[PDB]
Design a protein around this ligand. Structure first.
Ligand SMILES: Cc1c[nH]c2ncnc(NCC(C)(C)O)c12
Ligand SMILES: [Cl-]
Length: 167
């Protein structure tokens, strides 16, 4: 039993909710919140820009030190950093950004990072400003993640289509 509330159940392990991941994070304080990161950990917009704003830019400061030490992530890769005031940890996961021409096949690799954590709060990878079809992202999530994932979908209109079309 966990404190995630109001979710619709999709499969043995995936739950979905029309919700602002920022507001969900502050309420639940999950062990892991997933960020929709880029390889440079430049949290400018989309989910990343909003999460970073909620940390008063502490996420960006920590991220800049991470990159200065380690260099960029791989598309499909991840790193674990602090969750600041939002969660214990933030798993920064880089899905492909279609508006950069990145290969969509890497979306499965991106979701595989979730399997290293028993429970996560997350957005749909490569959705929003990364330019992938969220219906496809949800399908890859369900077919790749085996740990318990609670998906927050910000757009209510998008949320209803994912459910009604869900196979
Ligand atoms: C931008 C944002 C802020 N808080 C969020 N919580 C969940 N999903 C999000 N992004 C979804 C999409 C499809 C617009 O990228 C967000
Ligand atoms: Cl977005």
């Amino acid at each position: 039993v966990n404190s995630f509330s109001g979710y619709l159940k999709l499969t043995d392990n995936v739950y979905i909710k029309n919700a602002d991941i920022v507001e969900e994070a502050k309420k639940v304080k999950p062990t892991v919140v997933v960020n929709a990161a880029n390889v440079y950990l430049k949290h400018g917009g989309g989910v990343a820009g909003a999460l970073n704003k909620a940390t008063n830019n502490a996420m960006q400061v920590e991220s800049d030190d991470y990159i200065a030490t380690n260099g960029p992530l791989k598309v499909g890769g991840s790193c674990v950093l602090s969750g600041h005031n939002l969660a214990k940890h933030c798993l920064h996961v880089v899905g492909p950004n279609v508006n950069k021409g990145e290969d969509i096949q890497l979306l499965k690799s991106a979701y595989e990072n979730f399997n290293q954590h028993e429970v996560l709060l997350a957005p749909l990878l490569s959705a929003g400003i990364f330019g992938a079809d969220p219906i496809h992202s949800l399908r890859v999530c369900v077919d790749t993640v085996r740990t318990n994932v609670y998906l927050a979908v910000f757009d209510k209109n998008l949320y209803d289509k994912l459910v009604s079309s869900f196979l």
